[PDB]
């Protein structure tokens, strides 16, 4: 209907102006910019994009600004945008005037690839800075001052491919969804970068939606079936344990706690947030039993439970690198949920979370005024949480409008 197009646009246009008013009321710092790329760069909306913050932040005491560069994925080239935020956030008309007028120059470009996922690693052993995983399952290691990658893993061009690196940055895991069993590809990233350490096909699963490492010798895998398959670095064809959750919908992704080797975060299409301990799943034992898909949900009671906004399918989660209670959640429509389980740890200290408890646990909800439209580009990797800057996150929409901000939780630390 023609009114239906004037329906959703008009409602959001007021709702955006609603969130536009409380912008100075709910955040400590919020900024937006349009990426300015040189000639030849693809500016399409369906352009596959990703962003992740770098660790080479800069201080500016003479101007009170904090420089935070970010690596921007635009097709085959990687752009670098230095975000200007206030210095009072952790420890600006002209600072914005530069980046908006600075033509983004592609520092690293991988011709023949589509940037799907990237991981900035500070590894002085290989002297590398960024390792981007192409849409064709390919990865390329580029060092400082190098326009072309120094090492790459090139697969024959034909989907979904996810890449996760070990805690010591020595082992790389790569998924290859083949249209043919899904494969989890192991690549050593210490001395022999680019060579496959192993190949373990997962029979009966077509795609691996997410890859996440639990430790330096333990890894996990997630298929479309929502069954968590954790495979070990040891010499074993099958997973040592299998985690199956069908109570709160089909599982979408997972996250590993940086301080709790046993406690992890789970997500499902049903909008429920689950926190589970690895020792309990392994306590079941004997994953070598017949893989009865017909068997009901495993009787595994998780540690704690939460819910997203209106049961929104949680597509991504990442625990903070500075705080063990601050959690990042990604909804289906791009909204960034701010979760801080500090209240649950108190109710667990005096003795299911109540509706008021889950109401108190959410720090904030960043929808960007409904401007984060649901395009064809998956916004899973289009969100970057600062590992060294508290509550500072960056987002990339299909409109190219790059967003970086820090929310105000109101709790004076």
């Amino acid at each position: 209907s023609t009114l239906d197009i004037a329906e959703d646009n008009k409602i959001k246009n007021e709702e955006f102006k609603i969130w536009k008013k409380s912008i100075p009321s709910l955040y400590q710092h919020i900024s937006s910019l349009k990426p300015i790329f040189g000639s030849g760069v693809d500016e399409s909306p369906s352009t596959l994009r990703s962003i992740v913050f770098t660790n080479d932040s800069s201080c500016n005491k003479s101007k009170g600004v904090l420089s935070v560069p970010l690596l921007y994925s635009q097709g085959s080239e990687i752009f670098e945008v230095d975000c200007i935020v206030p210095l009072g956030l952790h420890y600006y008309t002209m600072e914005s005037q530069k980046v908006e007028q600075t033509v983004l120059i592609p520092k690293w470009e991988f011709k023949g690839e589509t940037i799907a996922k990237m991981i900035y690693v500070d590894n002085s052993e290989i002297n590398v800075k960024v390792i981007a995983l192409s849409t064709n399952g390919s990865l390329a290691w580029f060092r400082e001052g190098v326009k072309s990658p120094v090492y790459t893993m090139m697969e024959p061009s034909t989907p979904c491919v996810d890449f996760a690196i070990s805690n010591d940055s020595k082992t790389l895991t790569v998924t290859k969804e083949k249209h043919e069993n899904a494969t989890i590809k192991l690549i050593d990233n210490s001395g022999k970068i680019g060579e496959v350490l192993r190949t373990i096909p997962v029979p009966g699963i077509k795609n691996i939606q997410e890859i996440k490492f639990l430790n330096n010798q333990i890894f996990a895998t997630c298929s479309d079936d929502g069954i968590i398959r954790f495979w070990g670095n040891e010499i074993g064809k099958k997973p040592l344990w299998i985690l199956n959750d069908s109570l709160d919908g089909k599982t979408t992704c997972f996250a590993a706690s940086p301080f709790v080797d046993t406690l992890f975060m789970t997500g499902t299409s049903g909008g429920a947030l689950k926190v589970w301990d690895i020792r309990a799943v392994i306590a079941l034992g004997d994953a070598d039993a017949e893989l009865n898909i017909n068997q009901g949900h495993n009787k595994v009671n998780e540690l704690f439970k939460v819910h997203h906004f209106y049961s929104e399918q949680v597509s991504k989660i990442e625990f903070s690198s500075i705080s063990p209670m601050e959690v990042v959640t990604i909804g289906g429509l791009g909204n960034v949920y701010h979760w801080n389980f500090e209240p649950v740890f108190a109710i667990y200290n005096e003795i299911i979370i109540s509706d008021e408890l889950e109401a108190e646990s959410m720090a904030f909800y960043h929808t960007e005024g409904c401007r984060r439209e649901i395009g064809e580009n998956n916004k899973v990797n289009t969100v970057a949480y600062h590992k060294y800057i508290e509550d500072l996150v960056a987002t990339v929409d299909s409109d190219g409008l790059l967003t970086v901000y820090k929310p105000f939780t109101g709790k004076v630390l």
Binding site: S1, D4, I5, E7, D8, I11, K12, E15, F309, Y310
Partner: peptide, 16 residues
């Protein structure tokens, strides 16, 4: 009370 691109504006109303 319950109802009495067309579904798009409908899904937005339930959330608010």
């Amino acid at each position: 009370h319950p109802t009495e691109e067309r579904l798009i504006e409908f899904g937005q109303d339930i959330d608010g």
